[PDB]
Structure formats: C-alpha cells, structure tokens
Amino acid sequence: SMSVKKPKRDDSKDLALCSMILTEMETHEDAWPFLLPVNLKLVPGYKKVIKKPMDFSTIREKLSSGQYPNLETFALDVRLVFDNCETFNEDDSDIGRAGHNMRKYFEKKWTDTFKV
C-alpha cells in the first residue's frame, strides 16, 4: 500500500530474456503454424470463431516496439497463440499437435528462465 513497498524482482533484463525465448520459439521445427498471422480470408471460420488472433511475428512486433508493459503480458500473448490453436484444431492434427508441443516447450523455458 501507500509508502509500503514490497521488494520486487529485478526486471531489467526481462526484455532481452523474453526476446531470447521468442527466438527459440521461432526456430523450433514445429513453429511453422504460428510464425505468421492465420490468413483470415483463406481459412474459413477463423475470423468469426477466434476473437483475438495472435502469432509469433505479431508478438515479435509488439516486443520490438514496447507494447508489452511487463513479462506477464508477453506470456499472455504467447499462451493465446496456443489457446487459439487448441480452439480451432484437433489434438490429433499436425497443427494441433504442433501447438501442444510448442506450449510445453514454452512453459519449460518460462519456468527455467524466470521462476528462480
């Protein structure tokens, strides 16, 4: 509260770390469904069904232009990518499995990098 400051973690390297994690996402072999926005005029259903589309290149743009206030908002966009993927694609499919793989890959890096 007012004049009662909680000790807070050193956040000064968050930008460089999130960038590093994102680079590793982008270079993963199963990253191909998520590198670019889904084509709204070539993929039937997507615009109507998925209310907040997100992909790595959009994340990369927001990261490069100061549009994430904190590392938690960045992780929200990354998870949004895989949450959209689950919504639209069957777990069995190539894209669906890519999504589960990439989420697992992200969440470990997130823990390793930031949670102590």
What's the gap between Cα 4 and its chain centre? 33
Contact (Cβ atoms closer than 8 angstroms) between residue 14 and residue 52: no
- How crowded is residue 29: how many other Cβ atoms within 10 Å of its Cβ? 7
Q: Which of 6, 115, 21, 4 is nearest to 68 (CA)?
A: 21
Domains of the chain, earliest start first = 1-116 (1.20.920.10)
Percent helix, strand, coil in the chain (nearest 5)? 60, 0, 40
* Cα gap 114→22, rounded to integer Å: 14
Resolution (Å units): 2.1
Q: Quick one: tokens of 81?
A: 């990518």
Phi, psi of 94 (to 5 degrees): -60, -45
Contact (Cβ atoms closer than 8 angstroms) between residue 80 and residue 65: no
Q: How many residues does the chain have?
A: 116
* Cα gap 21→1, rounded to integer Å: 33
CA torsion, points 23, 28, 29, 34, in degrees to nearest 10? -70
* Cα gap 72→78, rounded to integer Å: 10
